[PDB]
């Protein structure tokens with residue numbers, strides 16, 4: 001099958017790209033695999049495939065780290081993401097985000113049920129597995145559990161059957177047949193869990209599929225709208241119906257080529273300790289445990305020689321930046337456009353630890369609105385910060401047409417030189433806040449509310465008559481013929 | 497003579513370092529020399545020495561561009577600055593700033609008058625030069641004049657003779673025997689000019705020396721205290737009295753080895769058009785001229801084969817970032833310490849276009865103060881923003897002991913993840929503002945007041961009991977033996 005539709009083929013694509021290191025000697029899942037992976041992420045090296053994981057028993061399991069991290073080159077920087085989506089490895093972030101947005105005005109292509117698939121090659125019942133005996137990684141030294149779930153897809157369905165949600169939320173091993181993890185508002189897993197809690201009759205039928213189709217894990221990490229089944233959106237984006245098989249112990253459906261599938265329930269009544277965990281913003285607060293969601297596992301099915309993907313998340317750059325940040329920015333871009341705001345592009349600068357989104361403004365359109373910074377700031381902020389897709393984002397930076405928002409250096413320059421602190425910003429204190437940002441959940445204020453800002457880096461004439469400067473750079477402060485002469489003579493004169 | 501005491505020897509040091517390209521074919525001072533220099537600055541290439549400048553007549557003049565810009569390597573990144581100060585080329589920013597601060601608690605070493613020097617090898621009276629006939633560069637295409645003065649040192653003395661100030665302020669050619677330029681508060685050239693204006697009897701005796709001792713041009717770009725003669729501070733820092741010769745037409749004294757010296761007066765009554773100019777923040781606003789200071793030139797003296805240094809300033813990275821930003825940060829560091837604030841280090845991140853200063857806090861000391869963020873923010877802000885040394889800086893970022901403020905990536909991470917917008921910041925609206933920042937002089941508010949902020953990126957426990965996190969990075973989230981094993985096995989496993 002194609003790499004974007006089959007995790008095993010995606011692994012073979014990374015090998016063929018020379019973007020994989022296969023480590024066939026024993027590696028310890030207690031910190032070592034994640035430490036290697038962490039180093040890869042901090043240095044944009046090749047993805048590690050741990051074929052010989054101390055503790056692997058009866059085919060459970062190998063580990064692929066850094067599945068959505070960056071490559072060293074500028075030319076194929078986003079190649080690993082492109083391989084999730086059947087895009088060329090040289091694809092730009094604009095092209096990747098466009099691809100992820102493309103299904104938003106297509107009819108869904110619902111999944112196809114098939115009788116069986118590779119995820120059924122092996123199975124373990126209630127009496128044959130113990131989750132504490134599998135080689136689940138300890139990802140960071142102070143983590144409060146072994147985080148089995150960093151790159152699988154939780155699958156839950158509304159009680160009425162009309163919406164089936166696929167998402168990534170973390171989970172750790174609690175005991176032999178339970179996980180715990182984060183199920184928090186406004187996330188769809190939480191929205192669905194609320195539905196089942198209000199019905200009050202049963203625990204939520206659940207499955208967790210690891211090593212799913214790469215196009216599916218990307219949609220899993222994207223805040224597509226409420227009520228939209230991710231399977232049909234992936235189908236539309238890929239132009240192909242995804243093949244799913246039914247779970248053995250419940251009536252949910254999992255991708256046929258899933259590497260590892262857990263089947264069971266998410267409790268509407270029980271909780272258990274989760275955390276702390278070394279998280280996307282680059283921190284772990286040791287000892288910081290909180291009661292979370294509790295999942296019971298009834299059954300494990302898996303492929304022969306199953307591979308568990310893993311995110312060793314933290315400081316720059318990993319899946320939590322490349323996927324959470326970029327995919328939220330993509331949804332925000334569309335959200336603004338649908339609210340008649342003249343936004344052309346959006347990206348979450350890595351330099352901001354993906355807590356900022358930069359919004360590129362079509363200033364011709366802005367000038368026709370005949371508005372002001374204060375007015376426009378408030379309007380953008382109300383649209384974004386009151387919507388789920390702005391959940392993780394605490395600062396919006398508005399920039400004109402000259403700035404490439406996919407270039408953090410240019411975003412920083414515009415922010416630093418065009419936005420007057422205070423005067424050019426509007427604070428938003430009565431919006432939902434992202435408590436995982438340390439200044440929120442470990443900060444001076446309410447963990448779940450406020451701390452958000454819109455920073456206007458549009459200059460005054462951008463609202464009226466048009467840009468009235470040229471940059472003092474090589475590109476803009478010298479005529480074209482001169483620039484060309486200088487470039488043509490550069491090595492001749494003696495430069496690098 | 498030594499490179500830090502003689503510009504001609506500094507040029508020969510850059511050659512010997514393989515940090516110079518000598519361009520011996522004709523180069524046009526109308527944009528081409530500055531366009532080459534601009535490209536060098538944007539790419540951290542070797543400094544260009546234009547030995548064959550179209551228009552050079554009777555030894556006036558060659559041009560050295562990018563004299564204080566960055567080298568490509570990390571190891572000798574600041575090598576060109578180190579060569580200003582007799583430091584090893586591998587010196588750190590901490591070492592350079594320490595050197596620049598070292599004279600602050602030394603007795604001055606006043607200059608030594610000598611009868612003559614190289615700057616007297618050639619001279620031109622009132623009837624033998626015309627400033628419009630020299631090969632003065634047009635640095636950016638929309639500049640409002642040919643900026644002769646981008647890296648020379650203005651020399652003015654208080655009417656009572658007790659304080660002789662050396663500083664860099666821009667100036668452009670106005671006519672055959674006059675320059676115009678910026679003389680603005682709170683700069684010492686302005687403070688002295690005010691003294692002469694209030695006496696009301698004569699224009700200010702003035703000289704402008706280009707290609708001065710490299711240690712002198714660094715002090716020229718530093719906001720050392722009011723009333724302190726830069727010559728004696730340089731003497732103390734270098735451990736040697738600087739040799740000066742008297743001007744021919746006035747009683748000021750210039751460095752003996754100055755490449756080019758203009759002698760004349762700064763008017764207490766006349767103004768003339770200055771600007772626009774492509775400036776440190778990365779912008780030029782074409783057409784934006786304002787009346788500035790007017791200088792009359794009575795005499796030119798110069799070395800045989802004189803060399804004019806030039807800053808082609810604008811977007812990152814040039815002298816306006818490496819020198820204005822870093823040297824203000826150095827003075828701010830000391831200012832805080834003298835006000836009993838527990839600041840260990842200060843730097844102006846290049847990513848902020850040197851409009852921010854990051855202040856590293858000794859948090860052991862902070863905890864003994866038993867204070868709060870709001871209190872501490874206000875106190876730091878009042879000390880810095882009400883003092884000349886904070887003039888150019890609009891945002892202060894307070895960070896704990898784990899952050900290296902000389903690393904912009906770590907400053908950005910701390911700012912983005914530890915400072916809650918609004919709640920963790922104090923705005924300062926009744927302080928002098930830096931009008932050259934586009935959001936000030938071309939912004940929505942008063943050009944000369946406010947727009948400043950203190951952003952507290954100290955976490956709450958840093959004020960009380962101590963840091964309560966570990967970073968989720970390779971360094972902090974894995975024990976030492978593991979990290980070493982991983983590094984030892986890195987290339988063996990197959991990584992880069």
Ligand SMILES: Cc1cc2c3c(c1C)C(C)(C)C[C@@H](O)N3c1c(nc(O)[nH]c1=O)N2C[C@H](O)[C@H](O)[C@H](O)COP(=O)(O)O
Pocket residue numbers: 149150151165166167168169170171182184186187188189220221222223224279280311313319320323324
């Ligand atoms: C790619 C990726 C995304 C997420 C996470 C991770 C990765 C790697 C972890 C490594 C496990 C870290 C963890 O903090 N994590 C995570 C999470 N969302 C949660 O509610 N809870 C979580 O613990 N998201 C983000 C969500 O996947 C997106 O917000 C998505 O939009 C949700 O889907 P939906 O609710 O919109 O359907």
Ligand SMILES: Cc1cc2c3c(c1C)C(C)(C)C[C@@H](O)N3c1c(nc(O)[nH]c1=O)N2C[C@H](O)[C@H](O)[C@H](O)COP(=O)(O)O
Pocket residue numbers: 645646647661662663664665666667678680682683684685716717718719720775776807809815816819820
């Ligand atoms: C290194 C350097 C410093 C400065 C400048 C330049 C360079 C290269 C220009 C390229 C010419 C750009 C110009 O904007 N410029 C400049 C200037 N100060 C001014 O009042 N006016 C100016 O036009 N400074 C900064 C001052 O040199 C420092 O603020 C110094 O502290 C002043 O000395 P003092 O008043 O403290 O004695």
Ligand SMILES: [K+]
Pocket residue numbers: 166167168219220221222223224230
């Ligand atoms: K999703």
Ligand SMILES: [K+]
Pocket residue numbers: 418419420424456457458459460935
């Ligand atoms: K603005």
Ligand SMILES: [K+]
Pocket residue numbers: 662663664715716717718719720726
């Ligand atoms: K000075």
Ligand SMILES: [K+]
Pocket residue numbers: 439914915916920952953954955956
């Ligand atoms: K803070």
Ligand SMILES: [Mn+2]
Pocket residue numbers: 165166167188223224225228230
């Ligand atoms: Mn969803």
Ligand SMILES: [Mn+2]
Pocket residue numbers: 661662663684719720721724726
């Ligand atoms: Mn001074």
